């Protein structure tokens, strides 16, 4: 019948906790260490307490993306609302890029305006919690689902940014004669952030461009299909992916003309669903006749 | 043979001119009206001459997206590099959102710091060219290809932003007693920008989520297919789209068991390619047997 029905359902549920819990943890931390600013110096933690609101924002946005992904397939969005996950993830990552650019420009400003001073010891304790809080905010998002993996890279990034004042603070406190080791620290650590976002960006860009999923390999799939009896030649094998774990596949095959078709494609479906989980298959089951010199449109992926 | 080979090839060529020409026009304008700043007041046009560089940047980025779209299909990117167009377009539009947010924040700053003054007559002539130049930069991008349509919305947006100082300038010159009609102008006109970007964003988001293309209609396609003789029931009709004009389709059909299959799907392909151009079709041609009460996974798009 070519439609097979808890292994997937439960996973949407786990992340839903791995985010709501992390969002709540960041909520607690932001609340506490902002009320610890009104009842003390009022320009102490707000600047750090800022970032925490950004992380919370990204976490709630990723959770919103999950809730969207839950929605059922419609007439307009046929396959379902799945890629909403990847979309929210890519939006969050571009927001990392934007926020980091903003921070780098403010660092350059502080450089061009060295007329500024901050007590280099209380500057550390405020950094330590920010590092510690980020340590916790990361280890909960330790990968997975495109949504959580987008929140982790978003969290880890803050960690490098978080120490980027601590490791700077110590160098300021232990030798305030320098005063210009902080901007270079923000620079290099923003670059580290950007490297991690480069990894995730490459992966989700390959996803959005209907690229074959990393988890698989095209020529391996052609071998795996052609390794079945009745077939003679498989042309136009396209295999893209939905968010992460919904691999689709669509192929033309040319089988033994006098052979019964439907058993051949049934066997192909069994072989494929045996090697790896699917989400749909539409094998066209063409005939022996094919205009081979003209199949250049479906000769093979050049690569 | 199910593979049919100048109607499409020439279109990549037209836009390639509709961008390179517009990029060059903006290049000319920026050059001229920046050298008209060194040889006069040096804080006159640079701020306007700034956004021209942003428009040029977006135009060259869209052209880069086109050049990517030209690349052939590979083993990793099976369908081809097509959606690179949509990706570059969405990036450019999010950059519109970012730049407009930046401008709105600087407007709020000018508000909270009314300690500032600018001659309200020379402020107009610098605005008029910016409006005129934007008038020209837009009417060349008058739509189409996802790349150009992304450059037009990007250009038109600057127009509203461009007059957003002129219409402000006049009100400053004709009554400098007000001095606070400029921020509200930037506000409302940024909102207009954001509305246009909302339209384009909705469309390309529907595209990226494998939504059926606007140009078509699902139930219309089911009627158009089921209107052919041999078929009995079509389930799991998925029809997404590549960038704009590469519509794909993939369907299971259940036809008369004793009937010859391949003629049925050949006729379906003829009917579809008759109603509207395609880019691929993989009709599975299932049998009469189907487990109807269990097809809930392929019952129909709820909507
Ligand atoms: Zn062919
Ligand atoms: Zn089916
Ligand atoms: Zn079914």
Author numbering:
A (entry chain A), B (entry chain B): 52 to 56, 61 to 198, 210 to 369
Question: What does the report in the manuscript say about this coordinate set?
Answer:
ZnT8, one of the 10 ZnTs that have been identified so far, is localized in the insulin secretory granules of pancreatic β cells and responsible for the accumulation of high level of zinc inside granules, which is required for the packing of insulin in the hexameric form. ZnT8 functions as a Zn2+/H+ exchanger. The structure of HsZnT8 in the outward-facing state shows a ‘V’-shaped dimeric architecture similar to the crystal structure of EcYiiP, with the two TMDs forming the branches, whereas the two tightly packed CTDs located at the base of the ‘V’ and mediating the majority of the dimerization interactions. Our structural and functional analyses reveal a total of 4 Zn2+ binding sites in each subunit, including one primary site in the TMD (STM), one site at the interface between TMD and CTD (SIF), and two adjacent sites located in an open pocket of CTD covered by a HCH motif from the N-terminal segment of neighboring subunit (SCD1 and SCD2).
Subsequently, we introduced two mutations, D110N and D224N, at the predicted primary Zn2+ binding site within the TMD of HsZnT8 (HsZnT8-DM). As the primary site functions as the transfer center for Zn2+ transport, we reasoned that by abolishing its Zn2+-binding capability, the HsZnT8-DM mutant could potentially stabilize the transporter in a specific state. Indeed, the double mutations appeared to further stabilize the transporter in outward-facing conformation and data collected using HsZnT8-DM sample prepared in the absence of Zn2+ yielded a map of the outward-facing transporter with an improved resolution (~3.8 Å) as compared to HsZnT8-WT, allowing us to build a near complete model containing 302 out of 320 residues for each subunit, with the help of the crystal structure of EcYiiP (Lu et al., 2009; Figure 1—figure supplements 3, 4a). The structure of HsZnT8-DM reveals two adjacent Zn2+ binding sites (designated as SCD1 and SCD2) within each CTD, in a pocket encircled by the U-shaped loop near the C-terminus of the protein right after β3. The EM map shows strong density peaks at both SCD1 and SCD2 that can be assigned to Zn2+ ions. In HsZnT8, Zn2+ ions in both SCD1 and SCD2 are coordinated in a classical tetrahedral geometry with the SCD1 Zn2+ chelated by His52, His54, Cys361, and Cys364, and the SCD2 Zn2+ chelated by Cys53, His301, His318 and Glu352. As the HsZnT8-DM sample was prepared in the absence of Zn2+, the bound Zn2+ ions likely come from the host cells for protein expression and appear to be integral part of the protein with high-affinity binding. From the structure of HsZnT8-WT determined in the presence of Zn2+, we also observed cryo-EM density from a third Zn2+ ion coordinated by His137 and His345 at the interface between CTD and TMD, which is designated as SIF. This Zn2+ density was not present in the HsZnT8-DM structure which was determined in the absence Zn2+, suggesting a lower affinity Zn2+ binding at SIF as compared to the other two CTD sites (SCD1 and SCD2).
